[PDB]
C-alpha cells in the first residue's frame, strides 16, 4: 500500500490550484441533513493506512512513474512529498479531531476535522479526503444495522414484554454479497457494533486487530444447511438429508434450509410428521431452526408459522401472542433489508405471532445495498489561512440548499437540553456552550486517542 | 490472508452434512434469468487468493483456534485440511472451467464450474463458493458500465454520425464512494473493460499485476478543480479562482466545478463575459470543461447549454444538432447512474444538442449502487458422485421458478444461429453442438489459462 497512490487522480494537481501563500486548509466530515448516525470506522483507517512512516523514497518514485503515464505529463508534487519524508521521517503532518467512535449523533453535525500542522503541507488535508471519506461505509452499515435493531426491539417488546435474544435477531450473511474481502471485514465489524451474529469471519479479526474486546470473539454462529447439502441427497431423499443433519447436530442449535422443493410440504409432512419425533425431543438450548428462502417473505413466514402451529404445541405468552415450543424456531434469510424486516414483524404482530418465534439473516441488504447518498456523507473545506489571514470558506449551490456547507473552524457541543450543536466560525472559542466534544485522534503520524470495541458498543446502545 | 478463514462460517460444518460416500461435488455459477453479462474478474481471485500453497500448518492451527471460539464447539475439519497440506503441499485439489474473460453471455448460462479433483476433497468445492461468488461484483460493474456505453453509443451516433470519444464519455470518479480500498481497485478495473477514464489509480495497478496490457497504463485523467480549490479563494473571488486555474492548465483540458455559489451566473457572467477571452483562445486539444454539480441533472445540463450557446459561437453539425466550439465542453458528474445518464442524453437530443457536447462522471452510481440481485449471480451444486454413482442435483422452490437451478454436468455452446446454449445432464458429451466454450483456468493450485486485459477489452466490444 502506497498512500501517494490512494487519492483521486485530479487531487494530484490541486496543490497548484489553491490561492498563493496558503498555510492552512482545514476540512470537516458530516452526514448532511435516518436522523442520527453511529460514528464508527475511522480508527481502522488511521491505523491501517495513515499512521507511521507512510512515505518512503521508493513510494515517491513509484508514484512519480505512475502519474507520468496516467496524466502523460509531470504534474506530480514530488517536492512536497520529499519534504514530508525528510522533515518528518515520512510521518504525515496532519491533525484529525473526531467524536468518540460509537457515538450516536444527529445529522448535520461535524463528526471529524482534518488540518495540516505544517504550512508547507497545506495541500495534504485534501489529498487524504478520498481515503478518509471511505468511513461513510462503516458509518452507514452501523447506522442501518442500528435502525434495524430499533425496529426489532419495538416489536419484540410489544409482543413478548422484553428484549431477550435481541442481539442475535439479525445475523450477517453478507460475505459473498459484498464487493470484496476487505469490504466483508469492515462491514461485518460495523454490524457487530449492534449485534452479536456474523458468518463473516474477517469481521472478528478486524475488531481484534484495530479495536479490541474483552471476549475471545465479538461474533457468533451455529451449524446450518445450505441448498447443496440438502439437494446432494437427491430429490426423493430430502427427508434423509433432514434426518442426517439434525442427528449430526442434536445437541446444538441447527438451521435447516427447507424450501429446496416445497417448503410447505417440508414443514407439514417432513418436519411435522415423519421427523416430528426428532424435533420434540430437542433441548431449549438446541432448537431446530426452520429456514424458508423463497416466495413472498411475509406470506411465506405466515404460512410456515400456521403450518407449524397446527403440527406442534403452541402456547400463548403473557402478552397474548402465539409462541412455538422452545425446540422450534424460524429464520428468514431471503430478501431481508430494513424495509422488508419492518413488514415481516408488523405482519407477524397483526396475526398474533410473537417476534420470539423468528430471527433474520441478511446479506446484500445489510452490507452492500448502501451508498454514500443514504446519509449524505460529505467532506468539505470550511477554513483556510492565506497570507496569514484566516477566512471562512463554504459552498452554497443556488439550486440545492441541502448541499450548503459549514463555515470556519468547527466544534461540537452539548446544548443546555443535552442535545448536540455544531458551532461555526470559531464560535466555540467563546465558551458559551462548554467544551468541544471532538478529541484529537491523530497527529503528526501518531494515533493519539483510541477506543476498544466494548466502549464503541456501549456508546451505540439503544435508549432501551 | 488465510483461505481457511475466508468462507461463510456455516460452511465449516458442511463436510458432516453431505451424503456419506460422496466423492465429487460439482457446482456452477450463473447470472440467473440486463440481458447479457460481461464475464470479468475471476482471474484476479484465482491469483490473489486461490493459487499456490494456500494451506500451511500455521494456517490450520489459526483456523482451529478461531473456530473453537466462534462456534463454542469443535466442528472445524482439521483432518481434511491436513490432507491437502500433506498430499498436495498445500495446493487446492480443485478444477475450475470458465468462459473466457470479457465474453458477453446471455442470462441463465453457465459461466464457470467448480469440482474437486480428489475424492477426499468433496467438501472443498463449496468451501470456496463464498470467495468465488464475489466475482458477482466485477461481473456486474463491467456489465452495467457496458450497458451505459450502449446508451452513449446510440445517442452519439444518432446526434453526431460517429463514435469518436465514446471511450472517454463515462469517467470513474467512484474512489471515495466505494466501501473499501480493495473494492476501489476491483471496480475501477471492471469499468476499464469498457472505457479508458478513471481517477482511481488502484484499478491500473490491479490490471498490470493480474491481467497486463501493451499500454503503459489502461486509464487516464485530466486536471480538475474541486469545491475546496475554488471556495478557498473566498466567495467574492470565484473569478480569480477560475482565472488562476485555466491559466495554470492553459495547454491541457481542464475541468472546473462551476456551481459553488450560482452555476448559472458562473456560466453566463464569469465564463460568458469576464473570462471569455481566456476560453476562446484555447486549443481544441485543451478545452475548458465546465462542471455543474447540483440541481436536477437534466434541467441543469440543459440550462447550462442554453446559457453557453448564447455566449459562445454554436455551430450545427451534419445531423442538425447543436455543437459548442471545440474549446468548450460540459461534464455532468452529479447524480449519474444508468437511469439518469439515459434521461440526460434523451433530454439533450430532444432539445437538439449533440452528445458530443457532454461527458459524464459517475461515482456511487458506477461502483457502489449495485448488488448480487441485479443479475441474480448464483453458485449452486448440479452434480454429485455418491457410492460411485453420478446423480443430477438441483433446487426447484415451489413458490419461485426463477430460482430453479440447472441439473447435472454442464457445458456452454454456440448454437447453429450463433447464440449460446448451456447443455445439462452431461449432454455436451454427445457432441451435437461443437466445442465446450468453458476452459480449464485452474487445476490443483495452478492457474492454467490466462487472458491479458487487451483480449478482455476486445471480447467485451459493442456490436456496432
Ligand atoms: N444459513 C443461513 N441462514 C440464514 N440465511 C442464510 C443462510 N445462508 C444463506 N442465507 C441467506 O441467503 C444469502 C446467500 O444467498 P444464496 O447464495 O444461499 C441463495 P441465491 O442468492 O443463490 O438465490 C445470504 O446473504 C442470506 O441472506
Ligand atoms: N472532477 C470531477 N469530474 C466529474 N465528476 C466529479 C469530479 N469530482 C467529483 N465528481 C463527482 O462527485 C463525486 C464525489 O462527490 P463529492 O464529495 O465531490 C460532492 P458530495 O458528495 O460531498 O455532495 C464523484 O464520485 C463524481 O461523481
Swiss-Prot record, chains A, B:
GO terms for molecular function: cytokine activity; identical protein binding; nicotinamide phosphoribosyltransferase activity. InterPro entries: Aldolase_TIM, DUF5598, N/Namide_PRibTrfase, Nicotinamide_PRibTrfase, Nicotinate_pribotase-like_C. It is an enzyme of class 2 (transferase). Its main location: nucleus. It is found in: Nucleus; Cytoplasm; Secreted. GO terms for biological process: cell-cell signaling; circadian regulation of gene expression; inflammatory response; NAD biosynthetic process; positive regulation of canonical NF-kappaB signal transduction; positive regulation of cell population proliferation; positive regulation of ERK1 and ERK2 cascade; positive regulation of gene expression. Its EC number is 2.4.2.12. It catalyses: beta-nicotinamide D-ribonucleotide + diphosphate = 5-phospho-alpha-D-ribose 1-diphosphate + nicotinamide + H(+). Pathway: Cofactor biosynthesis; NAD(+) biosynthesis; nicotinamide D-ribonucleotide from 5-phospho-alpha-D-ribose 1-diphosphate and nicotinamide: step 1/1. Inhibited by FK866. FK866 competes for the same binding site as nicotinamide, but due to its very low dissociation rate, it is essentially an irreversible inhibitor. Signal peptide: none annotated. Changing residue 156 to S: In a colorectal cancer sample; somatic mutation. Diphosphate binds at residues 176, 227, 291. The modification Phosphotyrosine is found at residue 168. It holds the Pfam family NAPRTase. Homodimer. Belongs to the NAPRTase family. This is Nicotinamide phosphoribosyltransferase. It comes from Homo sapiens.
Amino acid at each position: 500500500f502506497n498512500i501517494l497512490l490512494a487519492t483521486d487522480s485530479y487531487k494530484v494537481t490541486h496543490y497548484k490550484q489553491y490561492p498563493p501563500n496558503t498555510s492552512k486548509v482545514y476540512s470537516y466530515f458530516e452526514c448532511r441533513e435516518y436522523e442520527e448516525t453511529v460514528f464508527y470506522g475511522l480508527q481502522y483507517i488511521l491505523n491501517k493506512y495513515l499512521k507511521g512512516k507512510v512515505v518512503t523514497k521508493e513510494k515517491i518514485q513509484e508514484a512519480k512513474d505512475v502519474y507520468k503515464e496516467h496524466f502523460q505529463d509531470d504534474v506530480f508534487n514530488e517536492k512536497g512529498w520529499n519534504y514530508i519524508l525528510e522533515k518528518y521521517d515520512g510521518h504525515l503532518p496532519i491533525e484529525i479531531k473526531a467524536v468518540p467512535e460509537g457515538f450516536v449523533i444527529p445529522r448535520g453535525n461535524v463528526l471529524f476535522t482534518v488540518e495540516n500542522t505544517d504550512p508547507e503541507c497545506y495541500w495534504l488535508t485534501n489529498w487524504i479526503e478520498t481515503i478518509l471519506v471511505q468511513s461513510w461505509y462503516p458509518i452507514t452499515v452501523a447506522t442501518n444495522s442500528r435502525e434495524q435493531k430499533k425496529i426489532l426491539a419495538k416489536y419484540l417488546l410489544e409482543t413478548s414484554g422484553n428484549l431477550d435474544g435481541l442481539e442475535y435477531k439479525l445475523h450477517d450473511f453478507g460475505y459473498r454479497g459484498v464487493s470484496s474481502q476487505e469490504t466483508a471485514g469492515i462491514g461485518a465489524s460495523a454490524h457487530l457494533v449492534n449485534f452479536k451474529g456474523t458468518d463473516t469471519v474477517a469481521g472478528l479479526a478486524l475488531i481484534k486487530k484495530y479495536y479490541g474486546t474483552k471476549d475471545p470473539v465479538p461474533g457468533y454462529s451455529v451449524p446450518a444447511a445450505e441448498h447443496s447439502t440438502i439437494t446432494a441427497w437427491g430429490k426423493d431423499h430430502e427427508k434423509d438429508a433432514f434426518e442426517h443433519i439434525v442427528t449430526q447436530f442434536s445437541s446444538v442449535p441447527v438451521s435447516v434450509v427447507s424450501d429446496s422443493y416445497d417448503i410447505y410440504n417440508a414443514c407439514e409432512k417432513i418436519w411435522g410428521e415423519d421427523l416430528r419425533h426428532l424435533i420434540v425431543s430437542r433441548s431449549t438450548q438446541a432448537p431446530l431452526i426452520i429456514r424458508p428462502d423463497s416466495g413472498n417473505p411475509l406470506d411465506t413466514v405466515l404460512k410456515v408459522l400456521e403450518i407449524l402451529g397446527k403440527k406442534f404445541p403452541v402456547t400463548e405468552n403473557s402478552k397474548g401472542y402465539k409462541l412455538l415450543p422452545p425446540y422450534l424456531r424460524v429464520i428468514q434469510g431471503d430478501g431481508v433489508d430494513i424495509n422488508t424486516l419492518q413488514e415481516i414483524v408488523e405482519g407477524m404482530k397483526q396475526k398474533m405471532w410473537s417476534i420470539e418465534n423468528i430471527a433474520f439473516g441478511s446479506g446484500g441488504g445489510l452490507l452492500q445495498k448502501l451508498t454514500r447518498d443514504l446519509l449524505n456523507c460529505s467532506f468539505k473545506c470550511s477554513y483556510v489561512v492565506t497570507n496569514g489571514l484566516g477566512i471562512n470558506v463554504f459552498k452554497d449551490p443556488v439550486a440545492d440548499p441541502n448541499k450548503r456547507s459549514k463555515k470556519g473552524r468547527l466544534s461540537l457541543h452539548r446544548t443546555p437540553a443535552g442535545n448536540f450543536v455544531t458551532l461555526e466560525e470559531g464560535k466555540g472559542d467563546l465558551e458559551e456552550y462548554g467544551q468541544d466534544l471532538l478529541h484529537t485522534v491523530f497527529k503528526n503520524g501518531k494515533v493519539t486517542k483510541s477506543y476498544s470495541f466494548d466502549e464503541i458498543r456501549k456508546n451505540a446502545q439503544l435508549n432501551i
